[PDB]
From Swiss-Prot, chains A, B:
Widely expressed. The gene is NADK2. Keywords: Acetylation, ATP-binding, Kinase, Mitochondrion, NAD, NADP, Nucleotide-binding, Phosphoprotein, Transferase, Transit peptide. It comes from the Eukaryota. It holds the Pfam family NAD_kinase. GO terms for cellular component: mitochondrial matrix; mitochondrion. It comes from Homo sapiens (Human). InterPro entries: ATP-NAD_kinase_N, ATP-NAD_kinase_PpnK-typ_C, NAD/diacylglycerol_kinase_sf, NADK, NADK2_mit. Mitochondrial NAD(+) kinase that phosphorylates NAD(+) to yield NADP(+). Can use both ATP or inorganic polyphosphate as the phosphoryl donor. Also has weak NADH kinase activity in vitro; however NADH kinase activity is much weaker than the NAD(+) kinase activity and may not be relevant in vivo. The modification Phosphoserine is found at S111, S263. This is NAD kinase 2, mitochondrial.
Length: 337, 337
């Protein structure tokens, strides 16, 4: 049950310093902080490449603009070298459930890397390669959401945010989430939603978030999690309208918040109405729920459907989107100690 | 203590139908629904104008593009004829704490009108005029936020969303709120905030909301309010880790949520971090709090400071904004039964 690829594409993030270069000594604030960050990431990319080549593996190192589907098909395995952002980028071009995608955190002090290998492998990559070769790991297939688009006036062409018609399959899958909303941050969004083929219900809010189990810890977590002060208050209306302290409040906050996370393997969508407006003229139903399918009718003026923060689609009045989870969209990942 | 103005400007909202006209029978969905809405609003505007003129009051009726500061100064009183959106529009051009601004809800079935006179006066406007003339009302001065801008690379020119340097006063006041965030809905916002001259703390989130007491019921309410299911859950961790029902859950939800609203007369800012990202690489302090002053240092790429959903200012890395509450920005409104 081992695993040793012969061909690997590494797709490495572009650093802020590289960004500033491709755009023009100490300008404003974090001047040489950018250069320190750049050297850490570069050191780590070289460690990964050297380790692979030392195992006899043929490696091709690309940035964003040269990470393409052709390079993915050439490779036996994709390695994202950066942070969770780099894993989303890499996963966006993999649509084959058998193709391994592995993430290495190249700046652990500034990159969370929740989708990447544990931090120790960043500077101990031959060790990870040995664990793979020896089968000392397990496969984790992360469920992903796929998007269909139909209706009138639709435009299914994807837009890369990093620079009547029947249902058509959009060319990207969501590993984290589909966000839906007006482009203007302060403009309320208006749509109708049907969950698991239920009746259509109108909604006014600041958007909709539809996440996977993998995405349950990302945007969705910060949309729905309850502040420890909010439960201090809520538990105080309780005794007014058991004793409390920092102990009990922290216990109840974390149980509630853990209830927002679910397994990346579970094929269900966590769907949240983001900041709904109720009041005396509009009304809203549930705020969050699980489902296997949610369809959205756009009633918006200048709105987008945004996949993993990276790929955007037009979604204006007349457009109808269907999200669901399909086994062939499972993203093949690894789990190490 | 009566009140009868001689000159009045009425600023009336533009209807969707007027919008469609100024842009070109039954196109898509709500076809003649737009025309029904248009006739209701027009009927009501005529009732207001006829009532005023029947009291001997000279009236000038304007839409958005002709509501200007000159017309405001000509008038003894401004009347916004539409919904809360129209009140925000009208208030945006009044900077004199002595100048009355009155809102009439011209479509009560579709307009909340929380800033407007009670719905009965929409078709009983001579009655409101008599109550004013007789002193059968009270004045309500609603506190507003003012914005200063300083730093490097700043651009203080306002942008109408409806189509090194020392601190300079921005030309609009917030009756509802100042929103601050990246323009791209899915891009995390990065800034430093100082509350009541406290130490600077970095923050990563989906933006900041800074509202008045008037704005406490608007965006801020939907940013912070707790769902009745979330307290059902929270009260269930409580008994596990008094009896519950629909009764007790609704009682505790509404006490908690009422704690988010405060008097429009109170001169303090309710400040919320909108969807903060904590995790193992960033950290956040309080989520919401009251204050008299909050200063924000922009660390953003393409961000805006948006006042009452209507006026937008550039706010990118190097810009520094100061918000506070000043008595001369009080907005003079009326309260009737
Ligand atoms: N207010 C919010 O919570 C908010 C706003 C916008 C986007 N997001 C999330 O950020 C995603 C895009 O990430 P990005 O790296 O391109 O931009 P980003 O601004 O760097 O993402 C914000 C942080 O979330 C972390 N993250 C990403 N995916 C995660 C996951 N599945 N579980 C736990 N944490 C995760 C990122 O990890 P790294 O540090 O390793 O990059 C980063 O620390 C989006 O799909 C969305 O979920 C959240
Ligand atoms: N997710 C959200 O909650 C969200 C998102 C964007 C904006 N907003 C709020 O909407 C304001 C702009 O309003 P808009 O009419 O131009 O666009 P809008 O989309 O029509 O406003 C949304 C609703 O809030 C109501 N509202 C406005 N001010 C209020 C207040 N002080 N207290 C209670 N309710 C209020 C509006 O009343 P009417 O029906 O009479 O118009 C409307 O029903 C912004 O300042 C912001 O506060 C809220
Ligand atoms: Fe990132
Ligand atoms: Fe409105």
């Amino acid at each position: 049950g081992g695993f040793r690829p012969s061909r690997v594409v590494v797709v490495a993030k572009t650093t802020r310093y590289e960004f500033e270069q491709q755009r023009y000594a100490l300008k404003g604030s974090s001047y040489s902080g950018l250069l320190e960050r750049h050297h850490i990431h570069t050191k780590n990319v070289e460690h990964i490449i050297d380790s692979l080549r030392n195992e006899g593996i043929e490696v091709r190192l690309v940035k964003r603009r040269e990470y393409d589907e052709e390079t993915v098909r050439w490779a036996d395995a994709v390695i994202a070298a950066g942070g969770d952002g780099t894993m989303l980028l890499a996963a966006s071009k993999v649509l084959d459930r058998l193709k391994p995608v592995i993430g290495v955190n190249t700046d652990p002090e500034r990159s969370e890397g929740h989708l990447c290998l544990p931090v120790r492998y960043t500077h101990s990559f031959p060790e990870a390669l040995q664990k793979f070769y020896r089968g000392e790991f397990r496969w984790l297939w992360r469920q992903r959401i796929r998007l269909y688009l139909e209706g009138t006036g639709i435009n299914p062409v994807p837009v890369d945010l990093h620079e009547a018609s029947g249902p058509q399959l959009l060319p990207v899958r969501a590993l984290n989430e589909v966000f839906i909303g007006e482009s203007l941050s302060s403009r309320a969004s208006y749509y109708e939603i049907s969950v698991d083929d239920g009746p259509w219900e109108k909604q006014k809010s600041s958007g909709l978030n539809l996440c996977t189990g993998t995405g349950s810890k990302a945007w969705s977590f910060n949309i729905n999690r309850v502040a420890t002060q909010a439960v201090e208050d809520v538990l105080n209306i309780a005794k007014r309208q058991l004793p409390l302290n920092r102990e009990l409040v922290e216990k109840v906050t974390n149980e509630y918040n853990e209830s927002l996370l679910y397994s990346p393997e579970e094929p269900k969508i966590l769907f949240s109405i983001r900041e709904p407006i109720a009041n005396r003229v509009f009304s809203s139903s549930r705020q969050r729920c699980f489902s296997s399918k949610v369809c959205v009718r756009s009633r918006c003026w200048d709105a987008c459907m945004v996949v993993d923060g990276g790929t955007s689609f037009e979604f204006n009045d007349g457009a109808i989107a269907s999200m669901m989870i399909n086994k062939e969209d499972e993203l093949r990942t690894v789990l190490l100690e």
